[PDB]
Amino acid sequence: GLPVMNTPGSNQYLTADNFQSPCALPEFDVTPPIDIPGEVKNMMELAEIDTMIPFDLSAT
Amino acid sequence: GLPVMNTPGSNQYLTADNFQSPCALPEFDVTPPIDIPGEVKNMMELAEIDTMIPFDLSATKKNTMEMYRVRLSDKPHTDDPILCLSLSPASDPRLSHTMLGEILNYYTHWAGSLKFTFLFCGSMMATGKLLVSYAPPGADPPKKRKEAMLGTHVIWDIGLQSSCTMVVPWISNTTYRQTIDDSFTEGGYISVFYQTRIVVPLSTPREMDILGFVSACNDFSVRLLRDTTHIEQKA
Amino acid sequence: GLPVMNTPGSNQYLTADNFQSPCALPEFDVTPPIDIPGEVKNMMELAEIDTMIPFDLSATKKNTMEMYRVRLSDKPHTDDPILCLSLSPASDPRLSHTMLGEILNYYTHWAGSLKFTFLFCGSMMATGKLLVSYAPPGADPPKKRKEAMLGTHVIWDIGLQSSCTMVVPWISNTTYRQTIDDSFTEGGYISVFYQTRIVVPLSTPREMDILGFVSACNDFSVRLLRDTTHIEQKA
Amino acid sequence: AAAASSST
Amino acid sequence: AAAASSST
Amino acid sequence: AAAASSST
Amino acid sequence: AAAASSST
Amino acid sequence: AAAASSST
Amino acid sequence: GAQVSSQKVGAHESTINYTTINYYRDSASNAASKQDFSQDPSKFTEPIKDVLIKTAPMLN
Amino acid sequence: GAQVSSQKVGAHESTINYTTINYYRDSASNAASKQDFSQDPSKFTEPIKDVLIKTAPMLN
Amino acid sequence: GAQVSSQKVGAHESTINYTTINYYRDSASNAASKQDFSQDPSKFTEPIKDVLIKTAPMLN
Amino acid sequence: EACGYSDRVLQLTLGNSTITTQEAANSVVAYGRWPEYLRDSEANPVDQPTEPDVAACRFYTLDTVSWTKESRGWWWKLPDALRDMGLFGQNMYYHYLGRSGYTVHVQCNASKFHQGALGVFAVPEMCLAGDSNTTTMHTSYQNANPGEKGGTFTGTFTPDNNQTSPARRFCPVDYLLGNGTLLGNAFVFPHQIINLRTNNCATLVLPYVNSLSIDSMVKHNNWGIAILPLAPLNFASESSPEIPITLTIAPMCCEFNGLRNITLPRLQ
Amino acid sequence: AATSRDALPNTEASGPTHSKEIPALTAVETGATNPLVPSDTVQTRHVVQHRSRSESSIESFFARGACVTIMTVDNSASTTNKDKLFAVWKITYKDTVQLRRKLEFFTYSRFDMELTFVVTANFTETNNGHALNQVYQIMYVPPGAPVPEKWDDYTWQTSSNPSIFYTYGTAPARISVPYVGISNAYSHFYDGFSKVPLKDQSAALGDSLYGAASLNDFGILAVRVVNDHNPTKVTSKIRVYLKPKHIRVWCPRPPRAVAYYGPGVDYKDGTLTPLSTKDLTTY
Amino acid sequence: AATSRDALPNTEASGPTHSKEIPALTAVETGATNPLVPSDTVQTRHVVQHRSRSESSIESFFARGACVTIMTVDNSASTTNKDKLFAVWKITYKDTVQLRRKLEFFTYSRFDMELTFVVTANFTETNNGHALNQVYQIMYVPPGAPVPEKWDDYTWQTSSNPSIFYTYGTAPARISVPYVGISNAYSHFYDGFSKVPLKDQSAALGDSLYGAASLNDFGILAVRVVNDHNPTKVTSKIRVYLKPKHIRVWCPRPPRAVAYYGPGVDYKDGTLTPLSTKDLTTY
Numbered sequence A: 001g002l003p004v005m006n007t008p009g010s011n012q013y014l015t016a017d018n019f020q021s022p023c024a025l026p027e028f029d030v031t032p033p034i035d036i037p038g039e040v041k042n043m044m045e046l047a048e049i050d051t052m053i054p055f056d057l058s059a060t
Numbered sequence B, C: 001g002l003p004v005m006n007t008p009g010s011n012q013y014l015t016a017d018n019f020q021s022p023c024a025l026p027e028f029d030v031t032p033p034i035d036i037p038g039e040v041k042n043m044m045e046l047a048e049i050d051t052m053i054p055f056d057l058s059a060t061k062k063n064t065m066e067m068y069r070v071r072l073s074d075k076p077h078t079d080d081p082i083l084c085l086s087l088s089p090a091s092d093p094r095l096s097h098t099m100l101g102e103i104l105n106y107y108t109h110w111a112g113s114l115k116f117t118f119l120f121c122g123s124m125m126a127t128g129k130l131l132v133s134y135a136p137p138g139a140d141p142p143k144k145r146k147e148a149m150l151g152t153h154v155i156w157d158i159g160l161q162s163s164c165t166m167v168v169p170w171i172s173n174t175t176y177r178q179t180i181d182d183s184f185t186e187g188g189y190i191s192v193f194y195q196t197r198i199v200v201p202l203s204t205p206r207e208m209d210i211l212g213f214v215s216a217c218n219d220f221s222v223r224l225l226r227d228t229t230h231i232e233q234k235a
Numbered sequence D, E, F, G, H: 001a002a003a004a005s006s007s008t
Numbered sequence I, J, K: 001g002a003q004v005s006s007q008k009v010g011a012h013e014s015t016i017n018y019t020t021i022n023y024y025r026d027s028a029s030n031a032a033s034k035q036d037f038s039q040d041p042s043k044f045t046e047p048i049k050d051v052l053i054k055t056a057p058m059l060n
Numbered sequence L: 001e002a003c004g005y006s007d008r009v010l011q012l013t014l015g016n017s018t019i020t021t022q023e024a025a026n027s028v029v030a031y032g033r034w035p036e037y038l039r040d041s042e043a044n045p046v047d048q049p050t051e052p053d054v055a056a057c058r059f060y061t062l063d064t065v066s067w068t069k070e071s072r073g074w075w076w077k078l079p080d081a082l083r084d085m086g087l088f089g090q091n092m093y094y095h096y097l098g099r100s101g102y103t104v105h106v107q108c109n110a111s112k113f114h115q116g117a118l119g120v121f122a123v124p125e126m127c128l129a130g131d132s133n134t135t136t137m138h139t140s141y142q143n144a145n146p147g148e149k150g151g152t153f154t155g156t157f158t159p160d161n162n163q164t165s166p167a168r169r170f171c172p173v174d175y176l177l178g179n180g181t182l183l184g185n186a187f188v189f190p191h192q193i194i195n196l197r198t199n200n201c202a203t204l205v206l207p208y209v210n211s212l213s214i215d216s217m218v219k220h221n222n223w224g225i226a227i228l229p230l231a232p233l234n235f236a237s238e239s240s241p242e243i244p245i246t247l248t249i250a251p252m253c254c255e256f257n258g259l260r261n262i263t264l265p266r267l268q
Numbered sequence M, N: 001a002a003t004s005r006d007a008l009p010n011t012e013a014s015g016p017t018h019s020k021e022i023p024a025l026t027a028v029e030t031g032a033t034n035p036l037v038p039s040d041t042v043q044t045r046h047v048v049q050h051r052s053r054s055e056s057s058i059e060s061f062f063a064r065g066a067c068v069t070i071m072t073v074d075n076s077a078s079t080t081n082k083d084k085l086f087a088v089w090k091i092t093y094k095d096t097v098q099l100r101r102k103l104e105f106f107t108y109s110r111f112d113m114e115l116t117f118v119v120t121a122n123f124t125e126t127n128n129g130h131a132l133n134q135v136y137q138i139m140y141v142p143p144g145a146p147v148p149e150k151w152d153d154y155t156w157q158t159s160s161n162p163s164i165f166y167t168y169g170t171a172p173a174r175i176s177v178p179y180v181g182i183s184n185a186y187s188h189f190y191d192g193f194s195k196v197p198l199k200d201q202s203a204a205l206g207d208s209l210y211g212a213a214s215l216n217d218f219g220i221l222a223v224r225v226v227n228d229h230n231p232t233k234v235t236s237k238i239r240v241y242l243k244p245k246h247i248r249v250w251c252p253r254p255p256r257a258v259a260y261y262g263p264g265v266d267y268k269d270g271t272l273t274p275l276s277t278k279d280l281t282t283y
Ligand SMILES: CCCCCCCCCCCCC/C=C\[C@H](O)[C@H](N)CO
Pocket: B024, M091, M092, M093, M113, M115, M138, M139, M140, M162, M163, M164, M175, M177, M180, M185, M186, M187, M188, M189, M217, M218
């Protein structure tokens, strides 16, 4: 086999990682998308919408 | 999968290694740099700056402002030394805590030429000629102007140009010297003498100070990074 | 990650391996080479140099300067041997500690032609003819000039050219011989005889020494690196 | 190789 | 390389 | 490949 | 690459 | 690739 | 089949690249590329039939 | 996407090279190249408004 | 950056090759190539000022 | 110069103020960077900046201090030392953010028969050490910002012990630059030496330095000016000589962001 | 264009001199350092220089993992007065002294960060019981996120915080982090306060620590043993190694000469005499 | 252009001779070795030579990891009279004899170094307790750096020294080191002193060891067990294997013929009779 040397980080699980992995349902026939209205691409789009301020948080 | 064979060194952690590793904050919006003044690219840049030598580490003067002052006077000519210094830039107590000495204690080896500049802080009315010497190792360390004279030196004449620089040229058997006291890589002797004497008129102070500075020349380098002994954390 | 499958040999440490490994001192400023005289590229270069044979390992002479001296004399002709030697360059006690023998004890196998040079150290007034023989293995080892004569030999005439070289040609069944005493790879017999006799005038010494040297020819090689038995560390 | 390697 | 890389 | 491999 | 990749 | 692959 | 893309470089030590190869047949096995597009918030922030000009009166 | 560079060879057994490939999208994941630049100390050693000539009087 | 060389083939089952790639920046990390040169023993076997002809008298 | 000009003789003019000197030892520009205004590429606050120009970028002279045989040294912080200086201080307190560079001119003349040497150091982020050994990072804002009058070095660390009601102030030992590092190495910082036989002034041009393009001037000091006697004052034979040191400082290319009501700091 | 590993300048041959050029005389009052080389004051021969400053570049100086903290956790049975021990550490380079001293040669810095984790465990009692192999969870809790109160509360779900699940006995864990500062550079020193004391407002309110900026810079690391406890008790330690990669630094400072005393520049009594006795005229 | 693995010269056919050329006669007094080949003194046939000197090249001769030292450490509870045991070793090739002998065939050498570490552990008592898997730290302390005094003191932070953290049971650890000499080559032999005894100065001061150059050549390796101690005691040994790669050698020497006795060329009484009895005329 090809000579290799395991580096640190090996066998760990970083929850923020981004690797490939084997598929458990090979050749599955995926249902296509339809054009649903209201798609969002970035959370900041929502921040740009006006929402009402609870100014009076007094006890009663 | 691709046939592979684990070699020695596998799963180890070398603290001096240089590998890639997964990022814990993907797509993070990095704050850009601005153009801050005073950027440094190499630790040797700092070694080339002059810093003041604590020449007088005598018991009552050490760890005080006095340690930086070499006192002279208008006394009659003598061939005895004003100061004596070993060229051990990292280990000699007088050089070990200068900025040059400090950087040198993070490395095992040094090489290159050094330069000592002396500043006369007496009055404008004071005059004098001094001799600054460097003796490469291997003989009796100079104790008298007569011996000191025979090696590398500069006769400094005090006047408008306040200061004088003596260059200690790289003269070594080895290609690099160690940053510790060691006979095999010993560097020699720096010493200062009165050439004539300090002369003042009346109404003038008869004693005054000189200050000394050391910095590295452009041919100076260091290698084999190491931990310093100049800081610790007992408990 | 890329699918991989660990093969046998994984995580092992072969001392004869040849892999890369991380550097512990990154960016270290290496001191350059200078052109030192006497560089060697192959251990066989050393085997080609003549070194003196300890021919006389007799009990009182061994481990002393005497072991190097083969004493001759002006005595009357005889067909009896001056010396007898087995061609076992690594194992025979007389050859095993010569530089050739020493290098051969770091290898399991040897092959090639060897050459024995003899130096006459008697006086200029001494004359003589000697016969140096090599008998390939398989018959009665020569004990008399008559037998010795029938194989590979040189009749050496003593004169101005002080020394004489006999080449022992590579004659073997096997392609390589073992560096140990072994019948299957036995090499034969070296022996020296008086062809006529040593003759001196009066007022001249009647006994004298010859010295012998062995070195490898340019067709000589060794293989299968191994540890030697000529050094150890009991405790 | 030219095609394979697509680049972005 | 051209040939190797076959593509489908 | 030409482009990919940058070299320094 | 052309040369490397020998093919049989 | 041509350059990379040096060959000996 | 290697895919080469450039990293948006944060703190610096030409453009730097990284390389990706897909090992699996199913696209579900693929890592996330993060090469995503932004859209404008209009459909949420301004869902009005008549286009609005911000310097003019919203109501006229 | 491979990057080829040359090693400054210390003790010898043409130029020798080594090869690097970046596996991650984030430049923070990259190893250190060590291909660094030097600068001149002027801004610290000679921060004076008037350029200095070493053979002439520092003060005139 | 791959380096291709040929093996001197011992017992056989064209020339056969093997491939090497350096992974590290420091040449000290490199394996040994074993592609070594031989020299002639002259400087040790014949260090004499006057060149020697083997068929002629060493001393004349 | 064959037509007269020299290193030792300078004239500086900023606004309605001119300084002359006949005994300078050149000028220093810190890290070789001249003061400048904030560039668009590096800008951060989006509002139109206030730029006071001649009204604030002029020479303000602070209180003259006195050098003697017992002086251990003096320090000041910028912008703090200028907080009450005319229209500079006003623009400073009316805005949340501000940035400035400075020309620092230290003045100290004497005579051909005096001697002594002052080290003048401009230190970026000059954090000084406190007087307490039972708690750290505890010097109070009032104690940390002396304003124009500055503070001084001591030759001895003497720990505040009134634990009930602590001094809460700096205790800067001179040979340690008041910050735990040796004075002999302060020369890696932009500096000049006033050596009485050579010169009577020090001039340093300081750029705005920070890890931010602009910041709170009221909360944060960018530069420290430290003046320490490298070689002690001495004259003729008088056991008690004295000579004055005057500090004159000019804000340079200063600009302010985030206008509101005036900040009225509790400074006592 | 000059690189850290280029050879340094050659020495040039120089002969006798008798002139008005005065390299040796200077005036340090100016603030400058005399740029002299040996051929200025002595007769030099010619030397082809091979040495380089490769290893003293800023990257090369800091290219080492350094220990910044040791975290202790365990795996015992949580009981009414004492709980199973998880650990919380506020990220900093100032809990240890060696790397802190190196970074503080400079006022400001910029770098990507490489964190490597070494995990070691042992048996605390003269028992005989055993423990199956432990898995550790290292969660990064940035300032604002719910800090864990129990080894097993809801926060360890880490839906958005980055976590590392480390298996004991495997190669030490490692991740990289970008330059995450809210400034354009990290400030090793901050000469100021995070609060302006306002006259009009009461003093107690105006107050804050000298030299401290945001109370919680970079948040915390929270480590736990995921395994339910064994009858036998096992204690584990997590050593964190920090390496600055792709680093830039600005405004050089004199190195720390006396023992660190807290996160600031403060120094403690009785630690202020570093230099030792050595007479003026003694080699 | 001739490479270590090229075939050696062919034997050429040669016939009878009757001439004045005298290959066989020579004079070794000259200092030379007679370059004769078999066709010079006997009738040879023609032979196409296949053998090569590939395996006896300098690289090939030294291309083996060799044991240079065994280090012992343990993991017990540090108690008032006896402490947890960490190990310190001064780097050298002279603590063992086999590689030392091989290197000393030459006066000077140059090479990169490959160090491989084999770690083995065991239980020292007839206990029954256990120990979880150990992690070892191998720190390189170069001459000048703080040598560790305790298994756990501040020096093990390794902010600048290179350290290896080895996990037990994984493949043996390995690193490479460049040619680190302060000379242009390593000196296997140094005929001199590191100090000139000066008349004028007292003898005790002038003194130094014969053949020793810098008191501390290459510094030391310091090894420890990172784990806190178990109740049960485990002893571990670290075997260090050294391999010279990319090696060059100069000035050949006769090999060591009698037992080594110290770091120098000294020999001890009673070890000086290596050769054995064998009579002059006995095959
Ligand atoms: C799963 C592991 C994630 C680990 C995430 C760590 C992110 C936080 C990085 C800490 C940044 C610290 C930089 C050092 C200190 C600052 O330089 C000084 N206080 C000056 O600003």
